């Protein structure tokens, strides 16, 4: 144990699910498999359910198991995992045919979880992985920790994970996710869309979405020099736009910031707190919008930095006209910083770090699965003894 | 160990802590209060309330769940809170798992009436399978490897002093001070009032301020002086005169700076004014002429030990208690507090050697009550605690 | 508790070291690449 | 091949249920759900490449 060919990482999210089977060994590659997170559920007279990849003869209903990051249908969700897992087996079993003795003989699974999943959901998933998929080794890695492990392993930090309809805020102290501080706001990328609809009434949804995803949309805090600029439709249609391309991100940025502030203010050990504020981690699709992260930082500074009020400072400098020492405050944060990205994953640098949580998982899985110690995953041994409850003896 | 997983709930008078027995920290710490927003409607949770509070909307009002006894007094609201916890935080039917909850040490009287209201809530309403009630000072002490201990809990409602001898709680020596965290909030506010402009029904703003800047101020400005402050002052003065006179620095003149966010304004206190707030916990005769020095924490601790010596030698109980002093509670984390509680105890009992114990980890005392219940829930035998079942209720219901 | 807390802190502190080695390896790789690139066409 | 048999041939043994349990000292009066071990007696495929990015 274990073959690197064999490591399987799954990262399921509301819209899609990133998947990878086998680690490259030279450098880590950005996940190439992206499967929409949904399954079809046919209902068979007599009550029971059947699950397929396609609307079978238009008889099945379309189930989207994960919504706003939460599992809303645990059965369709487990069926969806099986569907992924089986597909991978078939694919490899064709290509190579001796696969069941090699690449498919011992498949350890790392499943990236979301803060919102029940213990009940996590146990059921564990049961499913050991009983239905007949897999033997499982790590359930929280998304937040994947984040901090990718980010050159930070003991103290805050994860701001911007989704489409919600943003999660998750403080990490001493490599532990602080559950009672964790929260999400019902606000994300779509907010930008919505802000823009108000500013550009005569546009439609696809036009607005296209602007957001275009080279000329940025958050300010040379394109910025031009009054108007140009970009091209999804359907090739050229669209011109004024100052609106520097708008629409503000309401979201303010909401996130207000939340970050209330959160970090409830970290009880001020020495931990100082560290967290100095390692803000921002992740998610939205964050790839040029200027966004820096704009968000800018706002956290504007709202939360402990520093002398400018008027007060201006008086003191007039007074000294007749050198001014710095006023020291008892509060934190006096320093706010974004955590430093690792620049030595070439493939990741190339594609941006909106999905860096996955790199977290590539690193953890290699660590854990290419070393003897079985301290951080459930094994068959353990499953046989405690069952799904085995899960809680290997939490991080 | 046992094949079970419990829900552990602690309803303090200020904070409520909830989570499962299988992990080291609680899933949630939320306020033991709620906003009633008006068709009525009930808001629970730290961010939900702070958001709603900042909206500053009429008709919004904060109400509490736990009286100053540390006991629930609004049981219709308590159910809504429990529902909220089980639905949105633990996310599990209350019918599945055993429940472990806390009560504060009492003199014994309110006990039966409470137990009944819990039956009604746990059984009639929620359909909980079975529950245990642990006594907070007792569990905290056990969680700390101690069977006998003098447990000094400084929370929001005041100080709660509880001698515990060989696993048993001495009820007549149970003592609850009236001055603690919430009191400190009032004083910080009244004193700073003129620098911040400011100088029930207006519960919403009182609450929001207590939960925001006032909380930060307490954690960063206040300190407890090691020795009676009036004496410290006379001394520091008497010394300062000599340094001055001698040639031809008084520590109380150090300044401390707090950025007050709502007005982007610096508030500066000298160290004395920082020491002053907690002095009230020890010498409450310094606010009103209506408080005797005996309502102060020092006399109170002493009173409770002496009432322990009356069991049912004294200079033995005294010796037991004083070699197992436990200091606990959110407010006990204010810098200088342990040392003053110790100095205050040591001088009322000079013949004896005090040894005190305290969780030094910031988080863990704020929720040490819940931590205590947690370590009860992980006890290896079902016989280690009284576990009330639907039965017990049935049988009490008879005549 | 103390054990879990330690094994956790220990895993974290090792990944830092893993990162450092990943970084050193990359640097060697990139250096060998640039070295050939800068003294040869195309 | 048959998905179920693919699952069966890879990765080469008990089963648990989540059910009512009633502890004993004989038996305590109460129940609670837990993960109990069972006694002796107790669809499709998708094509990657569509989902591969290109």
Residue numbers in the entry:
A (entry chain B): 3 to 223, 275 to 375, 394 to 467
B (entry chain A): 2 to 39, 44 to 204, 214 to 262, 281 to 344, 380 to 466
C (entry chain R): 343 to 384
D (entry chain P): 1 to 12, 22 to 34, 54 to 70, 79 to 90
Provide the publication's sentences verbatim.
SWI/SNF chromatin remodelers reposition nucleosomes by translocating DNA around the histone octamer, and in vitro assays have shown that they move nucleosomes to the ends of linear DNA fragments before evicting the histones from the DNA. RSC has a molecular weight of ~1.1 MDa and is composed of 17 proteins, with two copies of Rsc8 and one copy of either Rsc1 or Rsc2. We found that RSC is composed of five main lobes, three that form a relatively rigid core (head, body and arm) and two that are flexibly attached (leg and tail).
In order to shed light on the interaction of RSC with its substrate, we also obtained a 19 Å resolution map of RSC bound to a nucleosome core particle (NCP) modified with H3K4me3 and H3K(9/14/18)ac. Our data show two distinct modes of NCP binding by RSC, one where the whole tail is swiveled towards the nucleosome (termed swiveled), and one where only a small region emanating from the tail reaches towards the NCP (termed locked). The region of the arm lobe contacting the nucleosomal DNA appears to emanate from either the C-terminus of the SWIRM domain of Rsc8, which is predicted to be disordered, or the N-terminus of the Scaffold domain of Npl6, which includes a CRC domain which shares homology to the WH domain of SMARCB. The fact that we observe nucleosome-bound RSC, even without a stable binding of the catalytic domain of Sth1 to the NCP, indicates that the contacts through the RSC core are sufficient for nucleosome engagement.
